[model samples]
Target: SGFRKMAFPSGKVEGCMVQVTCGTTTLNGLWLDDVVYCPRHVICTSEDMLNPNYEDLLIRKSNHNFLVQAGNVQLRVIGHSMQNCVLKLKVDTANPKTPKYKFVRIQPGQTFSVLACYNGSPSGVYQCAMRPNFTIKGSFLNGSCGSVGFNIDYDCVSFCYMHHMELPTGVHAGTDLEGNFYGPFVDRQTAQAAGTDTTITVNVLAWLYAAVINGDRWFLNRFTTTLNDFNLVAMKYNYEPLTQDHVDILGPLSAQTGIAVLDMCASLKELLQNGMNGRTILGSALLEDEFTPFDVVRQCSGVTFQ
Candidate 1:
């Protein structure tokens, strides 16, 4: 029998190496499972994940860099020129509300370990730049380089678990194993599974507020306008900000009235895209690090984060 199933502690599923042969060639994959029943990784290019075709995949790139994976799930951008390259990880530092990229320089064969599980799921956007002058290329996803020529290994977890605060009052408490919840807002794996009913509820107040906080205005910038309006509304209407309940009670309503100041959030589901930045409307130190509560609405409304 040419079959073997590796084991983990307590028979737990972490991730594994899988190789399957077809005709003469062998296909390799990293079976990063335990998110759902199936392996979460894929041995396809960026284009292939979008539109995978076996016949077309045989065509490899010439004279370019390849995004390949080594050991477990370590990813590398191998180059033909044998030059030193800089690797940058786009992170949600949440300071100054601008995306801060973490960078490191390395020679060829050096790999970056990006675990898609740290934030309760796997997600990242990485770019490589070959130096002498060090001009950065596009992201590993949808970036047009030598076709991110490697296995696209991704993992998934419940979005609600990661950003539960974003959910509105009633649905917010129903995310963690509570039977009352009945959609992807409660379980992301259920949303991705084939044939599951994707529709979830949506309230105008949540969508409207999310649109304002996530959207932008010419003079106000993205997260800037909402803070100001929250300040003003509290001042004008005698809305309390210091009480234990005031912040929670008044926060969503403040932005609900300022829908005119900011544009509506476009493709609201994109807010839930794993590792997406700019959704933190306010700092954690400030009003509880704003989250996309609309994500609950969007997820339940048949929206896929990817």
Candidate 2:
């Protein structure tokens, strides 16, 4: 049905060079590791398929937000649609408003979330498939100027996995560095409008996508090409450590309010305030305030974001 257990280094890196047998289930995305995934086109038998996941599914999906559930987690990957979307997960919720539950164990289903973001499919380097070259027309919005725009109010950040069978994407270690791939998100577009100002209220990935990893401009293959090659990025991009700045540094008000990239976010404040022009941004990249609300649905199996 799915991947069978494999063995690898004990200290960490739980698995490597594992073998997969799609036995009965039909797996679309190929070469999946608990933390990795190859392209639908990735010819599993080829060297290309195994090079590095590169979160190829991203470029391949052409900026579409999609979700997958696999292994012990669920994910809503951000293709080119970085901040344009919002996402939520169905974990224990293990925290947030816990004391209010009256009973410590309401079986505490999943909650805490906002709308949007998802990602990839692939080619090049880890070529299971060519990812068939696609094109992005520099389209523009033409119409209605009666009213220029509106304002939105929302919190700073939120990030979570979507569904399953998702393989660990790019960087092997992982990254959304390119900044280019972080297309305008709307995965949570249905979540309705958010806020505004020149400042931004970004998603975790959108913030990263807004960055330029090391000296490189912005490309996938963060692992083999950059991090691994330089060794400078040895284990860079830890969610919690980097995430702490948002809470620890930015202050809870920053977490719960709108547009204020300040003291805490180091590169974030710099990027939002100074850098990032051709850099492109996601989430609330616009000179506007924005936020999304989520509707959590918990079934016997797990949680779903609507």
Candidate 3:
């Protein structure tokens, strides 16, 4: 069939080629996460082992420019532009016992470690900037994820730093899984098809904050934040990427009843668009050392890191 191949995200260093297939057609006309792989490596988190509808992808590290996986997601540190820059961290957590904020001037080709919150979940906020190039900052409010699943690490840390940018009011301005404009937190995942909503709304508020980030940014900055928070939220929550296995698993009946099979995921919309929309995923890491959607994210966001 006429189709293109799928592609990987930036900071990926290891693993082989991940492709999608249907019937007899091995094609790329699938979202990198929308489809499964020929060589499946679905490592499950304790909760999703059974009834895993999609493939749990593991993007390996490349060369020197690397994002070594530890507790949270990894990143491009060495030869990558990050080598010249830094991931300066400050406790964005809301805590009383002051925490010692940290920062790392990454050594290209070397390994780096992040202190998990209160000594645990490996989460924090940091800025990026160039040194030798004589410029830097967080317009590159780039989000770095990947945790060994600290499972839970929280802190009320607002670091001491200086940067020019707008802080999201944090005040939510959008509806949630339920069409509630406002009210008590609700679990939208109704018990259906061998699965449940599974996600806890307010407590984690993964989608909540993201949606508000989008709604607020739209209301504040007057633009579409399109904050695809679920990319990480859903990934971390279910411990896997959104794949076709999910949609295909639900079969067609789920869709017919207005009960979205993979409705829990924000990625479903775009992921499906990749294949059904008919575009092959490309296998082009030839320039793996050169560019990444991550870096472009930095660039497009207007962060001038050296």
Candidate 4:
């Protein structure tokens, strides 16, 4: 048996596409005045390419404080000639009007201390942007780097007056009870007492059962509907849900309700499922205390006061 050798064109050429096979490796090269790799594998071109530094950054929200923590943090400054390079850190509180930036210096391969603060607002995602700035060629070689995402878990109780009753058209419910509904609990003792009752009045018993079953259904429905609406709005605007467009549409609505709507919806659904009568519901208490029976009937039930 005999073996034959083959000869192929190599090196620089113009406007030619060539495939080269040597042993188990097949390399494809495209020629454009110079021999260039088919897919340009440009590695380490930029001097300041940052290695994956910093793990999950966490920010927690308390009553009036915001806590921040960074994980797996490292810094490396690689440059042909590096001098006086400063690292700039910026925190955008997701507010377009109120933008904040903080700065520090990194010496070649040193990490900076993480900073935490007490911000006076409900918890939200706080973003961090990092940049390295230096001078090159009589001008600044600002290699700005940014990590646009950091999550903050808000562990604070929102204060609002909540009612178990629906308001009649013209008259709002729970207006007279110290401005608004402000209880995460509607008589904690009563709720606990009811929990242990194996046998209770028909009305009370019905109310309790209704509260559990209906409450769950209401939550699932509300959550699903809201999420779907958000997705639809995002799709229509060609943006992701929770982006600026989606936020703009839903944010104001949420603010107006003051997050109380979500709470109320959840509470009412619970009350109904637990077999609680409309009047025995927490909302009914607020409505009965604040508004006249006539007002309650008209405003909440949409029925004329008889």
Q: What lDDT is reached at residue 98 by model 4?
A: 20
* Model 2 score (lDDT): 0.21
Please provide TM-scores, in order, for all candidate models, with all chains considered together.
Answer: 0.19, 0.17, 0.15, 0.14
Which digits, one per residue and each the tens of the lDDT, describe model 1 over residues 1-306?
111111111111113222322123222322221101111112244334444443343234321222223233333322221111111211112112111122122321111222222211223322221111111112322111111111111222211111111122111111111111212322122222212111111221233354344453221224323434443433442322222232344344445545432222222222322223433332211121111233322322333321
Query: TM-score winner among the candidates?
Result: 1
Q: Lowest-scoring 10 consecutive residues by lDDT in candidate 4?
A: 132-141
Error (Å) of candidate 1 at residue 121 is 18
Expressed as tens digits, the lDDT of each residue in 1-306 for candidate 4 is: 111111111111111222322122222222122211221111112321233111111112111121111212111111111011111112122212221221222211111111111111111121111111111001111111110111111221111111111112211111111221211212111221111111111222122223322232222233222444444543443322333332343333334334322333334334334433444332233211111112222222233211
What does the lDDT come to for candidate 1?
Answer: 0.24
Identify the runs in model 2 with alpha carbons over 4 angstroms from their true place: 1-264, 283-306
- Evaluate model 3: give its TM-score: 0.15
Score residue 241 of candidate 4 by CA lDDT. 30
The clash count for each model shown is: 4, 68, 34, 29
Q: Which parts of model 1 have CA positions greater than 4 angstroms off?
A: 1-17, 28-306
Q: Pick the candidate with the highest lDDT.
A: 1
What lDDT score goes with residue 110 in model 1? 16
